[PDB]
Amino acid sequence: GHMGNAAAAKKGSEQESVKEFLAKAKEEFLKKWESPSQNTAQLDHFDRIKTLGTSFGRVMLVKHKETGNHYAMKILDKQKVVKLKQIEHTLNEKRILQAVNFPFLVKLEFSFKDNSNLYMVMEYVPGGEMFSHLRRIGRFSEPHARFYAAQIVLTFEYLHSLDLIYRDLKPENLLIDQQGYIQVTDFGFAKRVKGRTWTLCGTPEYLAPEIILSKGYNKAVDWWALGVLIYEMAAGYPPFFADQPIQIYEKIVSGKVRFPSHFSSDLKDLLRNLLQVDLTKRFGNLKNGVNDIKNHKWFATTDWIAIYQRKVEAPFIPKFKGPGDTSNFDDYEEEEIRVSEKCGKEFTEF
C-alpha cells in the first residue's frame, strides 16, 4: 500500500481529532447563532481617522477611545440599504460574523446601530488585500501559494462543517496580516444552507460551472473556487478570463484548462481535481470529503496543525508601517456622517 501501519494510524488519529474539534466548534457556533449579540458599542466610543472606501455605506479607520485599538468600521446607511433591497444580506452577514470563530476569519469586535446607520467594527489589518500583493509580485511560488491555500482549506473545512457556503473566494477578499497569515473578510454572499441553493452570485472568474448553468449547487462551488485561487496565485492570472464575462463562462463550462509550463505535475493534478466540471469527481465533493485535498501530493509538506496554530513562518510579511498606516490607501472625500429614527423594524435583529 501507499502507507505502512505507522503512517496510517497517525493519519487515522489526526482525522478523528478533526471531527472532535468540529463537533465542539459547531456547538460554540450554534449558541451564538441562535442568540446573537447586539449593541456592544456606540459611535462616541471611537475617533474617526480616515475614510478608506465608499454604495450602501462607507468604511473608515476608527480608533477606540478607551483602549487605543484601531478598528475598521463599516458604516451602513439604513435607508440606502432598504433602497438597494439589501436587508437580508446585511442582517445575515453580521449574524454570521458575530457567530464564527477561526484564526483566518476577520473578527467582528463590535456592532451597533443608531437612528440612521448600522455599524460593524472589525479588527483592523493594515497589511492589505492579497490582490495588491499578488499583482505587485506577479505570481507566488508554489510553496508561497501553498501556505495561503492551506489556510483556505482549513477555513472552508470549518465553515462547511457549519453548513456555511462562502461563495466569494478571490484575492480581493483575502488580507495578509502582520504575521503574514490570511484573513478572510467579506461574508456578504455566505449562506447557511444544508442542501442546495440557487442564487446567481459570486465573481465571474471564480464562478463554478454549476452556478453558470443555472442548476442548484452546494458547498462544492467553494472547492472549485479554491482551484481558481490556487491557479491564480501560482500563475499570476486566473484559469478562465476574457474581455467579457460571457466568454469567461464559456471557458468555465468547457471542461478545459491550460497550465503554465512552470506548474509542477503535483499542482496540475490537484487543480484538475478541483477545477473538475463533473461534480461526481470534484475533490471536496467526494466520499473522503476534504481529506482528498489535505492528503493530495501537492500538500505533502503541509503540517495542517502547525498552520492552524500559526506556528509556520509565513513566507512574506507586509511592511509593518504602524497600526495606522493610512498611506497605502487611496484618498477619499471625507464625507461626514449624520444621524437624525429610520427603518426601525427592518433592523430589529441587528
Partner: peptide, 18 residues
C-alpha cells in the same frame, strides 16, 4: 502569450461581484 492576453483582457484590476 497567455500573460499578454490577460493584460489585453481589461480584467487585471479588482473584480466586482455578482
Amino acid at each position: 502569450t497567455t500573460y499578454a492576453d490577460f493584460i489585453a483582457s481589461g480584467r487585471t484590476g479588482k473584480r466586482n461581484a455578482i
